[PDB]
Amino acid sequence: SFSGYLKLTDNVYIKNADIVEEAKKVKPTVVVNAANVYLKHGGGVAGALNKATNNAMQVESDDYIATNGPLKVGGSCVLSGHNLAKHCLHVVGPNVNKGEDIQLLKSAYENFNQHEVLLAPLLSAGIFGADPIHSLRVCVDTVRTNVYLAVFDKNLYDKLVSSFL
Numbered sequence: 001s002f003s004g005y006l007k008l009t010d011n012v013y014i015k016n017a018d019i020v021e022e023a024k025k026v027k028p029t030v031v032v033n034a035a036n037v038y039l040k041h042g043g044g045v046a047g048a049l050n051k052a053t054n055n056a057m058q059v060e061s062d063d064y065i066a067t068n069g070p071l072k073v074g075g076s077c078v079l080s081g082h083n084l085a086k087h088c089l090h091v092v093g094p095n096v097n098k099g100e101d102i103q104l105l106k107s108a109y110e111n112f113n114q115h116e117v118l119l120a121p122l123l124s125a126g127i128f129g130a131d132p133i134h135s136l137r138v139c140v141d142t143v144r145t146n147v148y149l150a151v152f153d154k155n156l157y158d159k160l161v162s163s164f165l
Contacts, residue, residue: 002026002119002148008164012140012147016157019045019121019150020052023084028148031085032112032120033057034128035092037070039077044127053082061090073100074107089115096129105135109142117146122160126152136160 005013015022023031034045039061041050050057060079071077076091093108094100108123122139124130132151139147151157 002028005148006161008136008161009140011144012149014136014149014151014157014160016152016154017150018048018152019119020048020084022148022150023049023081023119024052026119027085028081028117028119029086030089030115030118031081031087032118032123033088033090034121034123034126035071035076035090036095037073037075037092039065039071039090045121049084049088052084056080056082057088074104076108076111085119089118091123093123093128093135094130096124097127102130102134105130105138106142109139112139112143112147113145115145117148119148119150121150121152125156132156132160133163136164 005015007013033049041047041058071092073092073094079088081088091108091111094104105124122132122135125132125135
């Protein structure tokens with residue numbers, strides 16, 4: 001299973017890791033993608049996960065969007081995990097840099113409750129512009145299923161652990 005995680009709560013675990021390398025190592029049932037409503041996996045975690053799939057995630061995502069239209073901010077869809085996981089849960093956290101309502105972060109994390117165990121990044125963190133300390137707080141207060149958080153940045157990981165209440 002998952003190794004080297006620090007236990008934050010009964011169900012939330014955290015590690016300083018590259019989520020792509022973590023997904024390849026573990027091949028979890030579910031890897032969470034920090035998706036946008038269009039499933040355009042250009043950068044951040046989405047760009048990295050997509051590049052690891054040799055663009056198969058993007059090809060599948062474009063077919064999903066062509067059939068279903070865009071996701072809602074706070075929403076999700078389950079697609080293939082390709083070479084990274086059984087499934088990829090594409091979750092759309094609010095993008096603060098696009099003026100999206102930060103209150104939608106709790107709705108975004110609620111999607112995780114539909115899966116018993118997940119490998120995930122902090123939603124709305126990084127290029128999505130939200131405070132990662134706030135994202136971790138919303139995660140612990142919303143997610144009830146087992147969530148293994150991968151935080152790429154060592155300095156951010158240390159700040160998250162040392163400030164965790």
